[PDB]
Amino acid sequence: SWGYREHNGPIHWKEFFPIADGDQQSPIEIKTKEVKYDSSLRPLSIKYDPSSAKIISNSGHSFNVDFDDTENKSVLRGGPLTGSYRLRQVHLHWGSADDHGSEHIVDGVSYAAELHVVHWNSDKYPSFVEAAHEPDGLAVLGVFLQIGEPNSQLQKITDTLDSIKEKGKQTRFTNFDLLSLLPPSWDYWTYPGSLTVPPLLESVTWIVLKQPINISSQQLAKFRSLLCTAEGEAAAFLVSNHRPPQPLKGRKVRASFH
Ligand SMILES: Cc1cc(=O)[nH]c(SCC(=O)c2ccc(S(N)(=O)=O)c(Cl)c2)n1
Ligand SMILES: [Zn+2]
């Protein structure tokens, strides 16, 4: 099965999922002199209910905070989006070293990690599952992490990781104030792309915030202790789980600011 190890990592994914070589793949290099300022883009309209968070799990590929998306308590609107995108899931990407952990790269600068906040278009689709197969179905907010002072909201996640070390394990997790976790500035870049993991579907409107948030080196290192392997399998650690940048193939990256 797919992963980030030598045999099963990003270079080999095209072997099980050919769209890995598609024309709208993510992540990408963001080259700021090539981005087009677009005055029709709107500021982000963000509403996240801290009670929406319910469970945190180890998928084998990252941790997932899953949100109750039964109704429209936590939604993203504005930005490049038409209509209302419902919060589903938060997860993180990192690398084995603090200087190279993010998926999107900005003029060659990788960050220490990158948080993804995944939402789905419930104004057009009846479920996440249906939305995930259409070009306008998903919207992902990408937030960079840089090493700095410890982050008291991320401490809440790190404190759970010992209880979910094995692939498949879950624990309850709620009262998570995702709105306060975001950086001061919500200036962003946006482009049409894909999931950055298999099945790599080309259904995502990416919204990548320019300003990073801080995490300490000790908090970040805790994520690398997660196993990519299940209880009863030979242990291997998820030291790195970021996909390299993919060809832009003529897509327009736009900025909400200039
Ligand atoms: C978000 C979610 C909930 C769920 O129940 N199942 C799944 S399958 C994984 C998936 O669809 C997915 C994974 C990664 C991403 S990412 N790395 O943020 O481009 C996305 Cl948009 C979607 N994903
Ligand atoms: Zn992701």
Describe the model.
The PDB classes it as lyase/lyase inhibitor. By secondary structure, the protein is mainly beta. It is built from four helices and 15 strands. The chain has helices at 128-131, 152-158, 178-181, 217-223, and strands at 29-30, 36-37, 44-47, 53-58, 63-67, 75-78, 85-94, 105-106, 113-121, 138-147, 170-172, 188-193, 204-209, 213-215, 254-255. The strands form two sheets. Strands 2, 3, 4, 5, 6, 7, 9, 10, 11, 12, 13, 14 and 15 form a 13-stranded mixed sheet that branches. The protein has a two-stranded parallel sheet with strand order 1-8. The termini are far apart.
Total helices: the number is 4
* Strand proportion: 25-35%
User: How would you name the CATH homologous superfamily?
Assistant: Alpha carbonic anhydrase
CATH class: Alpha Beta
Describe the sheet with the most strands. 13 strands, mixed
Order of helices and strands: EEEEEEEEEHEHEHEEEHE
The gross shape turns out to be: globular
The small molecules bound here are:
the ligand Cc1cc(=O)[nH]c(SCC(=O)c2ccc(S(N)(=O)=O)c(Cl)c2)n1, zinc ion
The count of strands amounts to 15
| Radius of gyration computed on alpha carbons | 17 Å
Specify the CATH architecture.
Roll
Give the domain tally: 1
Residues in helices, as a percent range:
under 10%
The third-level CATH topology is Carbonic Anhydrase II
Distance between the termini: 43 Å
Supply the helix-strand structural class.
Answer: mainly beta
